[PDB]
Structure formats: C-alpha cells, structure tokens
Write a protein that binds this ligand. Structure first.
Ligand SMILES: [Mg+2]
Ligand SMILES: [Mg+2]
Ligand SMILES: [Mg+2]
Ligand SMILES: [Mg+2]
Ligand SMILES: [Mg+2]
Ligand SMILES: [Mg+2]
Ligand SMILES: [Mg+2]
Ligand SMILES: [Mg+2]
Ligand SMILES: [Mg+2]
Ligand SMILES: [Mg+2]
Ligand SMILES: [Mg+2]
Ligand SMILES: [Mg+2]
Ligand SMILES: [Mg+2]
Ligand SMILES: [Mg+2]
Ligand SMILES: [Mg+2]
Ligand SMILES: [Zn+2]
Ligand SMILES: [Zn+2]
Lengths: 176, 63, 85, 162, 169, 222, 97, 38, 43
RNA sequence: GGGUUUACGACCUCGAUGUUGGAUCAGGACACCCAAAUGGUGCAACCGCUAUUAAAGGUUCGUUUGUUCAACGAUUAAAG
C-alpha cells in the first residue's frame, strides 16, 4: 500500500487516532500493530517519542522500522525543560553544552538518515545545533557549574509571570 | 476510538442539537449513534441572543 | 501519552555533571561528561551563534552559492504570494 | 524526410524509421544575407492566400502547419503564412492536403459553397440579423488584418471590413 | 448645452475631430525590418563565479583521481540513491554530477574528446583513487537497469566490456 | 543549468512607525458653512501637485480626472491595510481629506429656488497625480499585484506605477513626441491659429495640446 | 514517465534496451531507457525485468518488450524520436493487455 | 458553465480553449470552474 | 430600429459620423497652403 | 446599457390629441412562468437553486374592492 511515518511514544501505543483510522483504512489491524510496537519498544523508557515507518503491503501485511528518538526530546531532556519556548530568539528556554550536543549526535548517528548518509559527526552536531536554535535553547561554549541553576531560577520566574499573564489575558478576553 | 470505531466528544449547545439523529445517521449510513447530557452554561452568541430577544419581543407584541 | 517524567532530577548539579537524556533504555546507565580532553577540536571549531551572511561570504566557495540559492528561493516565494489559482 | 512503418508478422510488432531524400533550398537566393527564409527570398509583403506554390512548401500532408523552430520564419511571417494557409484551405486550394477517409468519402453531403478571403471559420460565425444603420453599421470582415502591409500597386488600401 | 467637463466624453465639433485625425501620431518606420536583418555583432558573455568554480572542480577531478567512470544517471528513488552512495563510500568511491553546459566545452578542450557521445543525456561521474573495478562492477550488477556507459582507467578509455576485462584482470 | 543571480537586498530603507494608512474623516472638523460653486477646473487639465515621489518607491498614478469621496477613501484604506505587510511595507496618502462640499436637492423639486444643501465632500484629482505612495523592503511585483485592484476600483483610470515605470513612460512619451513623423501637430496648429482653428478650440487647448479633453487624458496623443 | 505510470504497467514481463553508448544515434534510446526505468515505473509493478544491454560494436540501438499476453514488441530505434517511441509503446501496451 | 466578461483560471487544472468563436475556461477536476467569455 | 435620440447633431447624444481620408487630405492641403503663407509673411 | 415608475424640461397640440379601470380583439420585445435541449451545484432520490439557447403555442375560475394592485378559496404545465 505504502509507507506511513508516525512519531509514537515508547510503550504508549494506543489503538485510537491519530494512528487507528489510518491503519484501518490501509487495511491492517490496529491491535496487532500496537502489540508489535509494544513488544519491540518494551526495552525503551515508556514515554519518550520516536519516529517509525510502517510499510503496508498490498496483502494487508505490515513491517515496522523504528529509529532513534526525537531531537526535540533529546534537547529538552539535556536542558531540563518540559516544553520549549514560544518566541524563539527573543526568549531562552534552556542551556545545553557542546558536550551534551556531541553526545546527542553520537547517540543519534545510528539512525536511518545518518546511516544512509555516510557523514561524519560534524554535520550531525550542526543539525543538533540548528534544532536547538529552533527550539530556543542556547548553546554556550563551556558554562555549567552553577550559572545553569542561576538562569533556571530566572527562567522559572519568567514562566510563572508568563502563566499569570496568560491567565489574565484569557480572563480579559472572557469578560470583553 | 477503539478499533474501526472512533468516539468523538464535543461541547455543542442544546439549541443546535435539534434533529441531529437524522443527520448523523444520514452521514454515517445509519451506523453512527450519539449520546449527550447537559454539561454547563455559557454566554450565548450574539446571533442567537438577538434571535431569542426578537422572539420575546414578538411574543409580547410590541417591538 | 506525554513525555518522559524524568527531567532534571537535580537541575543545579546533575545537568552539569552529565546528560541524562542520552540513556534511552529502561536500564538506567548515564554516560560520563567525558571532559574536554576527549572530544576533538572540530566540536569547538564550528559556529555556535548566528549564521553567516551573503555580503560576508566569498564568491569562490560553495556555501556562498548555497546561501544565494536559498535567497533566490526566498525571493521566488515572496514574489509568488499572489497565486490566484 | 522520416517515415514510421509498422510490420506485423505473427503477434510480433516491428516499428521502423526510414529516411528518404528531401529537396533542398535553391542555390541562388536574391538576398543571401537575410536571416529569414521569406525575408531573404524577397517574398515579404508579396505573397497571399493564392500563392499555393509558396504556402505548400511548409505544411504537413494533412494540411497542418509546420513548427516555426523547424521552418525558420520570423514570428510575423509565420503568423501571416498560417493565416494564409487557413484562408487557402477554406477557399478550396490545396485539395490534396486532406486525410484520406475511404469510409467518409462515399456519404456525399451538400455541395461545397465557393468562397475566398475567408477570415473566420464557417462553423463559428453567426448571421448578422440587425446589420445596423448607416452610423452604426455591422461590417463584415474580409481577409485578414495581418496582410495589411502587402504591396498595393493601385495605391488604394485593402478593404478588410466589407 | 453641456459643461466643459462631463462624463460622456463630450463628443467634439467636426472641425476638432478632423484636427485630431490629422494630428494623430505617426511612428517612424525603417526601410528594412531589423528583426531578421543581419544581427549586430556578438555581445560576448562574461564568465561568472559559478561557472569558474565548476570548471576548477572538473579540472581538479580529472587531474587528481585515476578511475573516471561515466555512467547513465538513472531516475531512481532517493532512498535507493542514498543506499548506492553508502555502498560506494564503503569502497571509497564517489559519484559526481556536473552540468553538460560546463562539462562539454571542458571535455572537448581537454584530451577527453572521445567521451563526447557519452555526455549527452543524464550523467554520473564515478570518481575514485586506486581504481578497483571488481567491487564496483559487483555492486553495479545488483541493479539491472543502471548501465555502465564507459570511462577511463589511467588515461585509457574503456567501454563496459573494457571495464569488465580490467576488473577480471 | 541556469546561472545564479544575486537577489536585491534592502537595508537602507527604514519602516516608520504606524506603517498602515491613517483614517480619513468623511466631513472635515470644521464644516464649510458657505456653499461653493462646482469649479470643474480642479478636474480639468494636468495635475501640478503631487506629481513626483516623496519617500516611497511605488504609487497609484491617476491617468484621468475625477472626485474622491469617503467611500473611495475607505475602500483604499481597508484594502491596502489588509493586503500589505506592516513589517516590511509602509503606505501614505498623497491626496487630502474630502474638503470640497457637494450640494444636493431633494427629489421632486422644481428648478430654481436657490442652492441646495451640502450632501457630502469630495477631493478633486487631476490626471497625473499620485494617490497612495508605498515603500519598504519589498519588490514591485507583489505591490503592483495588490495595487491594481485599488487602481481599478478608483473612479478615474489608474495604474500601479513605480519610480522606474514612471520614468520609463515619461521618457517613452518624450521619445514619441520627438520622433513623430507627421509635420502637423495639435500644438503647432493651435499656437499658430492655422485654418482659424481657435474658433472651435478652447483657450485651455493652447496648454493642453490636445492631450486633455474635459476630464479625460489620452497619453498616446503626443 | 508519468504517462507510463498512469497506464498500469502491471501487464509487462521484460523490457530490454540494447544499445551502444559510443554512437551518434542513441540519444532517443537512452532517454527511452531512462523514462521506462523511472522510479514510478519501478513501483507501479515490481515483477518487470528492465535490462540495459551496453555494447560497443552493435551500432543498432533497439528495444524489446515481452509481456505476459505472449506478446513481443520489437522496435529498432535508429531515427525515431523518444516521444514517438514512448507513445507507440504506451498505445500498444494499452491496446494489448 | 458561467458566462463572464473576464475569464481567469481558478485552479492549475483549468485550460483556456477557443471554441465556436468564444473563449472557454474548462476544468476537469472542478467542473464548477467552467467559464465562458461573453 | 437604431434611432438617434433628439436631433441629429445637437444634443448630448449626436450622430457618430466619422472623419474620412478625403477630409483629412483637404485639411492637410489647407495646412500646407497656410504654412507657405506664414513663410512668405516672415521677412 | 434600457427607457416600465416618480420627478425634471415645457418642444407638438387649448378655432379640443376625450381622461382610470373593465368587455371584444389583440400586434410585438425577451429581461422565458410552462412546455424543449443542456452546464454547475453544498445535485443521493422526489423536490430544488442558479446559468446558457430557444418567443411557433399557452399562461384558470371565484369573494371583497371602481379599482391597476392587494388579501383569501380551489385548481393547473404554468397562472411571466
Ligand atoms: Mg549544499
Ligand atoms: Mg455652452
Ligand atoms: Mg475605474
Ligand atoms: Mg429625432
Ligand atoms: Mg441629439
Ligand atoms: Mg414610454
Ligand atoms: Mg431629467
Ligand atoms: Mg410649449
Ligand atoms: Mg425656453
Ligand atoms: Mg390643448
Ligand atoms: Mg382643426
Ligand atoms: Mg397578443
Ligand atoms: Mg434569452
Ligand atoms: Mg422548463
Ligand atoms: Mg407568446
Ligand atoms: Zn523574417
Ligand atoms: Zn479548475
């Protein structure tokens, strides 16, 4: 039938949308796919998302190809934040060191993309740096002793003020 | 949803739910069924508010 | 159906000590930070800031023409914004 | 000229291309330095729909026109020659430049009305029932306006709308 | 009587109509049309940085490496293209793609004029140091409709049969 | 294969504050109480003011004469504000607010009795005057595309021109008026009073040179 | 390639293009090969075998299509255009099969 | 068919053809894009 | 059928009678005569 | 663009161009209500809504009102 891309959680493979109707229209069952995915990713920490490609054949059979997790997840973990920044460039979400970037690149090099592409780690580090720039996470050369926490305190205060301002704007739009 | 059967929740006003079992069955070939219960109140949209106000005025006669 | 709950257990210290998100499998084994005597120099010999400019690149290398093609695509996209089809 | 031939011998189809001899340009043109065929053979503003000996040089055996990138005419001369070939085909010249339909040649129809200098197509023009008054008169177009630059030996302009 | 400024174009007096018709503009018309007149001399086009870079790269490729194989660039899926690229970089052989508009003049100016019938359609330049055609033909045999056009092995132009013979040698 | 041409880069242009078009009032802050005559000379003839660019690079040129009222002003303002990019483009007016009072009379009134009552205000526009002038770090293709609509919806014929297109059309008009072939020109005949043509001509034709007729302007008339 | 992909080539077994790339009349045959060996033509049917025979002294470029109706379309293309060969092959495939 | 004074292609699959002396915007995917120049 | 409103050559809507080549030639001839006149009236 | 309504003008008639509605007979235009051939639809079907072409033929009977109109009753393929 064709190939389907899906970013699925490690062990949280539910038989509902946004993956149920697609596979159902393709013809493949959903419970079989969820079982196979859970048995294939049971060794993975339940919760982290990873892209996978499902090749559905004309005889209603399917094969699964699982790769490395999402770079956004890798960066959020390495920075210690739950959600990225809204206004990229104007605000800073986290702080990741080139060491952490190199480790992320080394763990991610063994995927479909960077396997089909014989490319050294330099370009993968560049891709990770670009992804971090898009997420809004700064990459300092060598700065992590306690100033990471010094910036984390200001970031938490900024997030609190942002939540209060968002609630105030919602209340204003409600009473207007 | 579970399997070949999706379950979609929504918050629809009661004034807009009249005659919905004849439309849902029409678009689902008689296979779709729905259940609804009163949830909460909210400020009505200006169009239906103007509609019910004009209805009240025409009921009490004078404009 | 959300992200991993483990996120910066001890943010002031653990994040500086090493990265915890590199470990993917359920068996918790975090890798050491591998101090600066391990990674090669190309890691630090790359731009970690804003990108370069077309008025700063020299028109005899390939990245100059790559950025010029990017700018040409941008200009074509800006011009084709009035597609009435 | 190249010809495509097909050979069927027991559920085996053979498609072949055969190149035959073609006539070339005459050796002595009057204006060799001209880039265009017509404008170098000095036929510019000289031909018409009657000059079939010139209009039939570049057309397909089924009456179709030939591409400009293959012929070499300048755009205006190409458009003029296209309109002249259309007018000749409508007037009845070039009768052997039509497809041979042995099944359709038997059911004869109404006799062909004689015409010449026909601008539009006979199956697309509607009859002018009002015809207008003297101040607003619905004139009938005759010939093409692309041939308005031809040499006029009498000096009078060609009446393209009458 | 209408005003001096109206909306109905205010049809003029007959004398003014005649004056307008007489004073109408007449454009200058030359004796001979300049379109397919003998054209002006050639406006020599100047070389740019892109074509200079391409010429320099092609010269460096033809000067430095030894095995220069010419293959037909087949339109396959990019995933299979990346797979062949991986299999090529495994044996340390690379593939290049150059525009014909910059490759044909360089080829006919250099000593590789005998490769002209090879560089008309889509092209793939297999470039490698230490020519090892055995593994190359081994990995090209897996794909049936990717035909080896030809190439040169240390200033020796060979066809597909020549490449097969050099591999078996 | 095609060559890679460089792209135009705009850095010297500065987007001012409030780049959108300002709101125009239907009636001036002080209404004209005294009723004025409808001088049609403010439409007749070529425009003398607002004929050149001030700070922008594109504009809406009026190839004819007419009146602009609050409906036209609101149309232009709304269309330009909703179709422009306030981060890279700015627009400004070149015609004043409606100031000329227009009188009207009720239906069923016979002729005479005096002047009517002021109904609305208009802005006189002559041929060759700019209406809206735009600038910024944008090209002309998109601006022309979204300004042709306003130029068409304007009463008089209008075009979306730029500096280059305006200079090009003016130089083309000069070239035509200088390489004209026939020796007889409207200007020459009217200035010399040949054939006694001043009897049918107008005293303003000596300056209009046959290019302006009432409120209309023919740019191909030398 | 698109005209072939929108044709349903599932009813063809083998297509072999035998040519010599060192000639002066193999342009049409090379483009025919590249059009019949495109990715869409590959994915519309995987049972087909597309062979590209490269010789040096054959001097007669040609194409041979054997399809499962027991049919054999043989076209010795020395002067035909690629477009004409494409249209002929497509019309024959849609006529038989 | 809609009889209009100014024809314009409403999608990339509309084709403009001259038939019976008029211009026609024909569309095979969206038949509601059928326009006829009056 | 095609009526001219009002009088033929008076109102806002008149007869659209065009200018002919004969009238153009006559005007050009008169202009040439007047040009020769204003030349002879120069010195 | 047309000249159906009201108005504007006051050009032909004041040694007369008799003024609303109806009865009889209707001529014509199409900007088609029906009947006919089609296109698009958010056209499933029955009903519809628009647009194109076509004017040879039709376009009801009653209560109230002087009424043209208007409301209402029963129909028609329609009650232009
Ligand atoms: Mg690149
Ligand atoms: Mg007057
Ligand atoms: Mg207008
Ligand atoms: Mg009259
Ligand atoms: Mg009149
Ligand atoms: Mg009347
Ligand atoms: Mg009036
Ligand atoms: Mg009177
Ligand atoms: Mg009077
Ligand atoms: Mg009277
Ligand atoms: Mg009498
Ligand atoms: Mg009648
Ligand atoms: Mg009609
Ligand atoms: Mg009907
Ligand atoms: Mg009738
Ligand atoms: Zn020519
Ligand atoms: Zn369309």
């Amino acid at each position: 039938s064709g190939m389907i891309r899906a970013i699925v959680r490690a062990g949280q493979a539910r038989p509902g949308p946004p993956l149920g109707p697609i596979l159902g229209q393709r013809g493949v069952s959903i419970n079989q796919f969820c079982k196979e995915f859970n048995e294939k990713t049971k060794d993975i920490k339940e919760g982290i998302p990873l892209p996978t490609k499902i090749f559905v054949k004309p005889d209603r059979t399917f094969e699964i190809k699982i790769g490395q997790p999402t770079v956004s997840y890798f960066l959020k973990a390495a920075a210690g934040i739950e959600k990225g920044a809204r206004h990229t460039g104007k605000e800073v979400a986290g702080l990741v060191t080139l060491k952490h970037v190199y480790e992320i690149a080394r763990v991610k090099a063994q995927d479909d993309a960077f396997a089909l592409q014989d490319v050294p780690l330099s370009s993968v580090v560049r891709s990770i740096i670009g992804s971090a720039r898009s997420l809004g996470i700064r990459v300092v050369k060598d700065l992590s002793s306690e100033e990471l926490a010094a910036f984390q305190k200001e970031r938490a205060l900024f997030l609190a003020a942002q939540r209060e301002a968002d609630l105030a704007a919602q209340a204003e739009a409600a009473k207007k | 949803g579970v399997e070949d059967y999706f379950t979609l929740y929504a918050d629809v006003p009661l004034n807009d739910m009249f005659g919905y079992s004849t439309e849902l069955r029409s678009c689902t070939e008689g296979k779709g069924e729905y259940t609804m219960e009163y949830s909460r109140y909210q400020p009505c949209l200006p169009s239906t508010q103007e509609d019910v106000i004009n209805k009240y005025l025409e009921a009490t006669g004078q404009l | 159906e959300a992200l991993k709950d483990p996120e910066v257990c001890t943010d002031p210290f653990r994040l500086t000590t090493h990265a915890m998100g590199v470990n993917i499998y359920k068996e918790g084994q975090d890798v050491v930070l591998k101090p600066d005597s391990e990674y090669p120099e190309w890691l630090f010999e790359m731009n970690v800031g804003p990108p370069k400019k077309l008025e700063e690149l020299d028109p005899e290398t390939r990245e100059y023409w790559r950025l010029l093609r990017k700018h040409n695509i941008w200009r074509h996209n800006r011009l084709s914004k009035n597609r009435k089809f | 000229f190249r010809e495509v031939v097909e050979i069927l011998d027991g559920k085996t189809t053979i498609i072949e291309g055969r190149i035959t001899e073609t006539p070339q340009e005459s050796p002595n043109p009057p204006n060799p330095t001209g880039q265009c065929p017509i404008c170098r053979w000095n036929l510019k503003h000289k031909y018409n729909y009657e000059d079939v000996l010139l209009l039939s040089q570049f057309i397909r055996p089924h009456g179709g026109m030939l591409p400009r990138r293959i012929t070499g005419l300048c755009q205006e001369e190409h458009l003029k020659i296209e309109e002249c070939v259309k007018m000749a085909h409508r007037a009845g010249l070039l009768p052997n430049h039509r497809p041979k339909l042995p099944e359709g040649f038997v059911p004869k129809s109404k006799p062909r009305l004689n015409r010449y200098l026909t601008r539009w197509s006979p199956r697309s023009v509607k009859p002018i029932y009002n015809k207008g008054h003297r101040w607003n008169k619905v004139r009938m177009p005759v010939g093409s306006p692309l041939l308005k630059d031809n040499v006029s030996y009498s000096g009078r302009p060609l009446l393209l709308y009458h | 009587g209408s005003k001096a400024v109206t909306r109905h174009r205010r049809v003029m007096h007959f004398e003014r109509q005649k004056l307008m018709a007489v004073t109408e503009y007449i454009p200058p018309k030359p004796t001979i049309n300049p379109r397919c007149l003998p054209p002006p001399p050639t406006p020599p086009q100047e070389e740019t940085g892109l074509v200079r870079l391409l010429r320099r790269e092609i010269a460096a490729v033809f000067r430095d490496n030894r095995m220069i194989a010419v293959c037909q660039h087949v339109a396959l899926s990019a995933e299979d293209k990346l797979l062949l690229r991986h299999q090529l970089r495994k044996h340390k052989i690379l593939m290049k793609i150059f525009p014909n508009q910059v490759l044909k003049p360089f080829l006919e100016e250099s000593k590789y004029q005998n490769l002209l019938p090879l560089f008309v359609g889509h092209n793939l330049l297999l470039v490698s140091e230490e020519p090892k055609v055995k593994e190359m033909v081994r990995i090209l045999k897996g794909i049936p409709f990717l035909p080896l056009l030809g190439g040169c092995i240390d200033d020796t132009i060979l066809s597909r049969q020549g490449f097969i013979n050099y591999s078996k040698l | 294969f095609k060559t890679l041409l460089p792209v135009p880069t705009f850095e010297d242009v500065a987007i001012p504050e409030k780049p959108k078009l300002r709101f125009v009032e239907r009636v001036p802050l002080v209404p004209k109480v005294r009723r004025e005559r409808k001088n049609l000379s403010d439409i007749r003839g070529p425009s003398t003011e607002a004929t050149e660019f001030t700070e922008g690079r594109f504009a809406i040129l009026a190839l004819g004469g007419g009146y602009l009222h609050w409906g036209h002003f609101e149309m232009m303002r709304l269309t330009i504000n909703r179709s422009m990019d306030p981060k890279n483009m700015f627009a400004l007016w070149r015609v004043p607010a409606p100031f000329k009072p227009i009188t009207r009379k009720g239906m069923g009134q016979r002729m005479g009795g005096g002047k009517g009552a002021i109904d609305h205000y208009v802005t006189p526009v002559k041929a060759g005057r700019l209406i809206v002038e735009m600038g910024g770090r944008c090209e002309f293709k998109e601006v022309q595309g979204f300004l042709d609509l306003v130029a068409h919806k304007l009463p008089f014929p209008a075009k979306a021109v730029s500096r280059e297109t305006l200079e090009k059309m003016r130089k083309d008009q000069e070239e035509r008026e200088r390489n004209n072939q026939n020796p007889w020109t409207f200007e020459r005949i009217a200035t010399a009073n040949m054939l006694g043509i001043r009897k049918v001509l107008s005293p303003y034709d000596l300056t209009h040179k046959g290019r302006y007729w009432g409120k209309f302007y023919t740019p191909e008339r030398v | 390639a698109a005209a072939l992909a929108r044709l349903g080539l599932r009813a063809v077994k083998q297509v072999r293009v035998q040519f010599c790339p060192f000639e002066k009349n193999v342009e049409s045959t090379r483009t025919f090969l590249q059009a019949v060996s495109s990715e869409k033509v590959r994915c519309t049917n995987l049972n087909c075998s597309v062979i590209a025979d490269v010789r040096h002294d054959g001097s007669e470029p040609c194409v041979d299509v054997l399809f499962g109706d027991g049919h054999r379309l043989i076209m010795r293309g020395a002067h035909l255009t690629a477009q004409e060969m494409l249209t002929a092959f497509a019309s024959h495939i849609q006529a038989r099969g | 068919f809609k009889t209009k004074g100014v024809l314009k292609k409403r999608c990339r699959d509309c084709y403009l053809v001259k038939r019976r002396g008029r211009w026609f915007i024909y569309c095979k995917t969206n038949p509601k894009h059928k326009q006829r120049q009056m | 059928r095609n009526r001219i409103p009002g009088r033929q050559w008076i109102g806002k809507h008149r007869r659209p009678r065009p200018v002919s080549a004969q009238a153009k030639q006559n005007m050009i001839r008169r202009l040439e005569t007047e040009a020769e006149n204003q030349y002879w009236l120069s010195r």
